[PDB]
UniProtKB/Swiss-Prot annotation, chain A:
Subunit structure: Component of the chromatin remodeling INO80 complex; three different complex modules assemble on different domains of INO80. Interacts with DDB1. Interacts with transcriptional repressor protein YY1; the interaction recruits the INO80 complex to YY1 target genes. Interacts with YY1AP1. Interacts with tubulin alpha.
Family, similarity comment: Belongs to the SNF2/RAD54 helicase family.
Role summary: ATPase component of the chromatin remodeling INO80 complex which is involved in transcriptional regulation, DNA replication and DNA repair. Binds DNA. As part of the INO80 complex, remodels chromatin by shifting nucleosomes. Regulates transcription upon recruitment by YY1 to YY1-activated genes, where it acts as an essential coactivator. Involved in UV-damage excision DNA repair. The contribution to DNA double-strand break repair appears to be largely indirect through transcriptional regulation. Involved in DNA replication.
Domain notes: The DBINO region is involved in binding to DNA.
Listed name of the protein: Chromatin-remodeling ATPase INO80
Subcellular location: Cytoplasm; Nucleus; Cytoplasm, Cytoskeleton, Spindle; Chromosome
Tissues in which the UniProt entry reports expression: According to PubMed:10574462, widely expressed. According to PubMed:16298340, specifically expressed in brain, liver and pancreas.
Phylogenetic classification of the source organism: Eukaryota, Metazoa, Chordata, Craniata, Vertebrata
Additional record remark: Although the ATP-dependent helicase activity displayed by the INO80 complex requires INO80 ATPase activity, it is likely that the helicase function is carried out by the other components of the complex, RUVBL1 and RUVBL2, and not by INO80 itself.
Curated annotation (Swiss-Prot), chain B:
Full protein: residues contained: 724 to 763 of 1556
Tissue: According to PubMed:10574462, widely expressed. According to PubMed:16298340, specifically expressed in brain, liver and pancreas.
Entry protein name: Chromatin-remodeling ATPase INO80
Miscellaneous information on this protein: Although the ATP-dependent helicase activity displayed by the INO80 complex requires INO80 ATPase activity, it is likely that the helicase function is carried out by the other components of the complex, RUVBL1 and RUVBL2, and not by INO80 itself.
Origin superkingdom: Eukaryota
Binding partners and assembly: Component of the chromatin remodeling INO80 complex; three different complex modules assemble on different domains of INO80. Interacts with DDB1. Interacts with transcriptional repressor protein YY1; the interaction recruits the INO80 complex to YY1 target genes. Interacts with YY1AP1. Interacts with tubulin alpha. (Microbial infection) Interacts with Epstein Barr virus (EBV) lytic switch protein BZLF1; this interaction participates to the activation of early lytic viral genes by BZLF1.
Entry's family note: Belongs to the SNF2/RAD54 helicase family.
Described purpose of this protein according to its UniProt entry: ATPase component of the chromatin remodeling INO80 complex which is involved in transcriptional regulation, DNA replication and DNA repair. Binds DNA. As part of the INO80 complex, remodels chromatin by shifting nucleosomes. Regulates transcription upon recruitment by YY1 to YY1-activated genes, where it acts as an essential coactivator. Involved in UV-damage excision DNA repair. The contribution to DNA double-strand break repair appears to be largely indirect through transcriptional regulation. Involved in DNA replication.
Subcellular location: Cytoplasm; Nucleus; Cytoplasm, Cytoskeleton, Spindle; Chromosome
Free-text note on domains in this protein's UniProt record: The DBINO region is involved in binding to DNA.
Length: 39, 40, 53
């Protein structure tokens, strides 16, 4: 979706469930984002 | 390894740096619109 | 040798890095972002293959 040919920028809305299966995958995605930023 | 990842990542990062090309969008952000994400 | 159009300094630097890495007989990976035109850099490298080998 987001690309260099978009002058409207983008709006990213991520729907996360409340405290059931969401916290683990979200925390793992945050740690994975930290590892990707460190790489 | 895990605990040795400081020296292994220090030598492996600069050792594998010549064989890879790392580019960031911050340099191309001049003609690129701002990006943002909001979790709900 | 690119009939699509002109290339920018990032695409020219990527193609020059791929050709310079290919001149030494070694291989490498491209970690550049997906919005950098990696396909246009690959086809532009096929147009940079003019060494004829």
């Amino acid at each position: 979706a987001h690309r260099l040919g978009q002058t409207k920028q983008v709006t990213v809305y991520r729907l996360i469930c409340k405290g059931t299966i969401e916290e683990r995958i979200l925390q793992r995605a945050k740690e994975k984002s930290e590892i990707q930023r460190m790489v | 390894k895990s605990a040795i990842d400081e020296n292994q990542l220090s030598r492996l990062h600069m050792i594998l740096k010549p064989f890879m090309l790392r580019r960031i969008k911050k340099d191309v952000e001049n003609e690129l619109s701002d990006k943002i994400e909001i979790l709900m | 040798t690119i009939f699509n159009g002109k290339l920018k300094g990032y695409q020219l630097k990527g193609m020059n890095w791929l050709a310079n890495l290919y001149e030494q007989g070694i291989n490498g990976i491209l970690a550049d972002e997906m919005g950098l035109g990696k396909t246009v850099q690959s086809i532009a490298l096929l147009a940079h293959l003019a060494e004829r080998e």
